[PDB]
Amino acid sequence: APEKCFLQITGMTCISCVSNIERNLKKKDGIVSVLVALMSGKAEVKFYPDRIEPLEIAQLVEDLGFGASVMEGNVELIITGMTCASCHNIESRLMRTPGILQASVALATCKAQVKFDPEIVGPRDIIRIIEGIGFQASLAHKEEIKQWRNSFLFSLLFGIPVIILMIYMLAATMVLDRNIVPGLSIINLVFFILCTFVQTLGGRYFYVQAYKSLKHKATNMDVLIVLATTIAYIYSVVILTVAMVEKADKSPETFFDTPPMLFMFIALGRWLEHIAKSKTSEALAKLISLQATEAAVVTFGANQIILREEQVAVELVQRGDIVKVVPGGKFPVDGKVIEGTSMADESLITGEPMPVRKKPGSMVIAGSINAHGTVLVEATHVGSETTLAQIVKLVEEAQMSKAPIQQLADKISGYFVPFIIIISVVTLVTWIIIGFVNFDIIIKYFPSYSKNISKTEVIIRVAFQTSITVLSIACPCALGLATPTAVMVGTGVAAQNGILIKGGEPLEMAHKIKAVMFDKTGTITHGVPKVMRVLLLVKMPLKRMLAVVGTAEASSEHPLGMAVTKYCKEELGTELLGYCTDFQAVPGCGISCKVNNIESVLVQHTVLIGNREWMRRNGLHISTDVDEAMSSHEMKGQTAVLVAIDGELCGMIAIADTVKQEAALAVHTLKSMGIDVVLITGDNRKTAKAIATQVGIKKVFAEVLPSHKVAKVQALQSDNKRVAMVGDGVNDSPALARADVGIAIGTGTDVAIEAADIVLIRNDLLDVVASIHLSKRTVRRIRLNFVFALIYNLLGIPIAAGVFMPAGLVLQPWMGSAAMAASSVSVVLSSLQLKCYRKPDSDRYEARAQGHMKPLTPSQISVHIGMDDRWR
Numbered sequence: 001a002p003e004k005c006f007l008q009i010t011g012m013t014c015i016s017c018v019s020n021i022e023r024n025l026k027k028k029d030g031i032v033s034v035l036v037a038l039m040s041g042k043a044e045v046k047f048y049p050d051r052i053e054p055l056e057i058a059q060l061v062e063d064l065g066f067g068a069s070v071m072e073g074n075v076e077l078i079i080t081g082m083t084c085a086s087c088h089n090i091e092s093r094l095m096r097t098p099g100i101l102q103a104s105v106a107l108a109t110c111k112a113q114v115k116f117d118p119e120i121v122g123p124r125d126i127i128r129i130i131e132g133i134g135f136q137a138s139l140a141h142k143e144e145i146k147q148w149r150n151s152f153l154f155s156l157l158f159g160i161p162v163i164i165l166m167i168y169m170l171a172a173t174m175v176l177d178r179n180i181v182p183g184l185s186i187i188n189l190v191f192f193i194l195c196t197f198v199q200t201l202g203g204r205y206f207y208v209q210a211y212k213s214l215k216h217k218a219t220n221m222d223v224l225i226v227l228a229t230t231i232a233y234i235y236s237v238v239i240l241t242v243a244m245v246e247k248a249d250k251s252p253e254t255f256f257d258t259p260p261m262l263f264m265f266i267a268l269g270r271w272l273e274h275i276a277k278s279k280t281s282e283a284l285a286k287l288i289s290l291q292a293t294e295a296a297v298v299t300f301g302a303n304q305i306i307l308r309e310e311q312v313a314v315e316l317v318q319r320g321d322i323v324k325v326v327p328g329g330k331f332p333v334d335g336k337v338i339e340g341t342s343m344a345d346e347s348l349i350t351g352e353p354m355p356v357r358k359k360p361g362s363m364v365i366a367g368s369i370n371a372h373g374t375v376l377v378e379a380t381h382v383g384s385e386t387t388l389a390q391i392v393k394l395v396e397e398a399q400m401s402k403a404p405i406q407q408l409a410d411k412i413s414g415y416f417v418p419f420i421i422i423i424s425v426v427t428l429v430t431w432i433i434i435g436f437v438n439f440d441i442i443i444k445y446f447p448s449y450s451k452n453i454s455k456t457e458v459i460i461r462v463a464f465q466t467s468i469t470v471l472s473i474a475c476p477c478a479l480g481l482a483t484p485t486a487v488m489v490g491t492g493v494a495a496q497n498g499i500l501i502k503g504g505e506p507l508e509m510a511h512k513i514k515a516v517m518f519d520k521t522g523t524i525t526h527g528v529p530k531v532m533r534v535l536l537l538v539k540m541p542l543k544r545m546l547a548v549v550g551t552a553e554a555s556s557e558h559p560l561g562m563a564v565t566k567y568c569k570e571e572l573g574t575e576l577l578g579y580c581t582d583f584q585a586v587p588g589c590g591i592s593c594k595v596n597n598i599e600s601v602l603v604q605h606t607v608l609i610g611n612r613e614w615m616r617r618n619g620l621h622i623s624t625d626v627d628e629a630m631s632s633h634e635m636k637g638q639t640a641v642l643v644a645i646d647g648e649l650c651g652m653i654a655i656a657d658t659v660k661q662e663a664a665l666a667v668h669t670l671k672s673m674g675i676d677v678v679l680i681t682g683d684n685r686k687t688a689k690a691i692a693t694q695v696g697i698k699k700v701f702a703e704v705l706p707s708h709k710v711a712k713v714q715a716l717q718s719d720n721k722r723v724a725m726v727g728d729g730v731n732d733s734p735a736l737a738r739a740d741v742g743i744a745i746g747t748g749t750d751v752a753i754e755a756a757d758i759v760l761i762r763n764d765l766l767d768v769v770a771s772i773h774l775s776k777r778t779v780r781r782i783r784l785n786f787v788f789a790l791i792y793n794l795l796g797i798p799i800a801a802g803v804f805m806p807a808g809l810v811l812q813p814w815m816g817s818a819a820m821a822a823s824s825v826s827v828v829l830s831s832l833q834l835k836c837y838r839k840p841d842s843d844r845y846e847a848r849a850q851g852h853m854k855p856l857t858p859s860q861i862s863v864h865i866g867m868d869d870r871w872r
């Protein structure tokens with residue numbers, strides 16, 4: 001019992017791997033018990049220290065074929081009625097009981113924390129003790145959109161009148177120019193009030209965002225707008241104040257137009273950007289729902305002593321408890337099957353729908369679907385140690401590992417901010433130099449000389465005005481709309497094309513994909529078995545035999561049986577099945593039936609269906625020719641079942657999974673573009689190799705656990721490659737979250753759909769190629785939009801700086817407004833034009849692969865099993 005040792009085991013890929021390890025280790029003398037997990041690769045061994053040593057245990061595990069290395073409980077409860085400090089009694093009683101290390105209770109919140117050894121004490125014991133005492137105990141982004149929307153609305157409310165007044169003044173006005181005081185004017189006063197409101201309210205979020213950006217040692221669009229608007233607002237106030245002091249006859253021109261203009265559009269762009277980025281992460285909630293909510297704890301044993309059956313919450317269960325699973329109910333916790341035989345569906349881990357036989361001494365997975373009978377399970381892993389919980393942890397880690405991507409607008413603004421400052425400073429110094437040296441150019445191009453102020457003031461004031469005009473014109477207005485507008489339009493195109501894209505990230509990353517991994521079941525081939533071929537081993541028509549088999553197999557519940565029946569129905573008129581029929585079945589051995597309704601088949605004695613073992617035990621042998629056919633069929637990893645009548649061999653039926661017709665074309669198309677194709681699946685190597693040969697995938701991975709899939713994705717990403725994961729099962733969810741781009745089949749599991757960032761509503765593999773092409777068109781359009789959001793402003797900078805002054809061109813007041821409309825309209829029109837995109841026709845893909853596509857020999861395909869390639 002004492003000196004329990006901890007071991008780490010690698011190279012295990014099956015639950016049968018765990019069962020063999022446990023059985024062999026327990027068989028050896030000295031070893032008392034062993035526990036181990038599949039994905040965690042962690043094991044605990046209890047043995048007598050005086051008989052065997054940890055080094056021997058590691059050597060024994062290594063001999064089994066799995067690498068072994070030697071390496072080194074808290075409960076929170078809420079208790080009612082904790083209104084008195086004396087009820088100290090609870091803590092003292094807990095300390096008295098063995099196996100409890102510490103226990104404390106807080107009177108302020110009635111919360112209690114207990115630390116103990118799980119192997120000796122559990123939460124149930126503490127709860128029972130508390131109940132006995134006399135008290136009950138029980139175990140314990142949109143903000144950005146809202147604030148951006150508020151800022152945009154406030155700017156629009158206090159910014160629209162600013163634009164309306166400007167249009168009225170420019171288009172047409174002497175009344176508005178009337179001066180209440182010599183330095184100010186009614187029009188100027190209105191501009192100042194509205195601008196102040198916009199800056200105080202609309203610019204509040206801009207200031208903090210820029211303030212936060214500065215703490216990040218980086219500059220982005222928010223910093224650019226804040227600096228530009230603040231400078232323009234400050235200068236306007238100063239010129240107004242000096243004009244009032246100097247009581248000038250004519251009020252100076254103010255730059256109150258800019259801050260309302262930039263805040264409105266930038267806030268709108270940021271609001272649109274965050275709306276597109278909005279997404280849901282309900283995948284974690286779906287995974288939690290899979291776990292069972294209750295278990296049927298048993299008392300004593302199951303041989304000759306049984307007293308009570310108690311419904312206990314899964315969280316309250318502890319290791320070593322015995323639970324009962326009814327058929328159709330989920331397994332509550334991982335454990336060992338004792339005195340129970342039934343069918344278990346383990347699509348959570350391996351992903352296939354084929355049930356796996358469970359026999360006493362075997363192991364089960366939490367969340368697996370039980371059927372065919374009742375089962376008694378001895379829990380071994382509970383709580384977060386369950387396999388399902390480990391998957392949830394992997395999904396959480398993958399989601400948290402997705403760092404944010406810097407927007408192209410922010411990157412452009414990073415270089416823009418120094419650029420505008422440099423030209424603004426350069427424009428200031430040169431104009432000051434020009435005025436000081438000559439002072440004649442200023443008079444010719446500026447009537448300000450008529451004022452009585454000194455010459456130095458005129459040259460300084462004009463230089464400051466010219467530099468600031470350059471700065472205001474330089475700052476773009478449609479920069480924020482460049483990316484979000486195209487992204488939203490691109491998403492609409494995807495929706496019209498049967499592709500659902502969650503957020504704008506996938507559209508900006510699919511074009512970077514260089515490696516794609518496809519799951520086998522459901523993704524590359526249909527998830528339900530289908531009859532592949534039928535052969536004849538007196539010589540009745542094949543159709544009559546098929547009808548006879550269908551009637552006998554009508555009541556069968558095996559997926560193969562129903563697949564055979566539907567295939568027979570399709571081959572026949574399937575008007576109605578025969579009435580008279582007797583059914584008898586030996587599970588895992590075969591099925592026998594009595595059919596005497598052959599007349600019904602003719603209008604439209606004994607039937608035996610089974611395998612090699614059934615024939616051998618029934619006195620029927622296997623011929624050489626038929627045996628060779630079975631070996632060839634089995635070589636392709638497909639099931640085969642033989643039919644006999646009245647003890648005489650009749651024929652054989654082969655059932656195999658049919659690959660999607662477009663899977664081969666999609667794989668070839670991806671390869672033609674220089675994108676690697678990888679087939680990763682949890683099925684046996686034989687089936688994976690056959691599927692890969694059919695579709696032409698060079699790299700095949702088989703017997704892969706969910707943890708292994710994440711590792712493979714991480715390994716591919718480590719090589720600077722972008723990985724696009726395609727899957728439909730629960731086991732694929734952690735890979736989809738970890739992958740750069742996640743694609744979920746439309747008919748797949750709910751968890752897979754939520755985890756994946758892209759959903760194929762039309763469940764056609766060609767959409768993966770189409771999505772990459774659609775992303776390429778979007779990114780190219782986004783860059784063009786940025787040009788439209790900068791070229792108009794860039795062309796205006798020389799005019800503001802006065803480069804074209806000698807040519808007769810001057811910065812007219814309406815140019816600033818004109819630049820906005822041209823840039824905003826151009827960006828919107830450019831983004832909207834993406835709606836004309838059309839999905840490439842399947843004929844084009846076929847024509848492009850008329851001769852390039854060619855089947856691949858099975859000998860050239862390399863099959864790798866496991867992560868370390870320990871096995872062949």
Ligand code: ALF
Pocket residue numbers: 350351352519520521522680681682683727728729730731732
């Ligand atoms: F269908 Al799979 F891994 F083969 F999810």
Ligand SMILES: [Mg+2]
Pocket residue numbers: 351519520521522523727728729
């Ligand atoms: Mg699948």
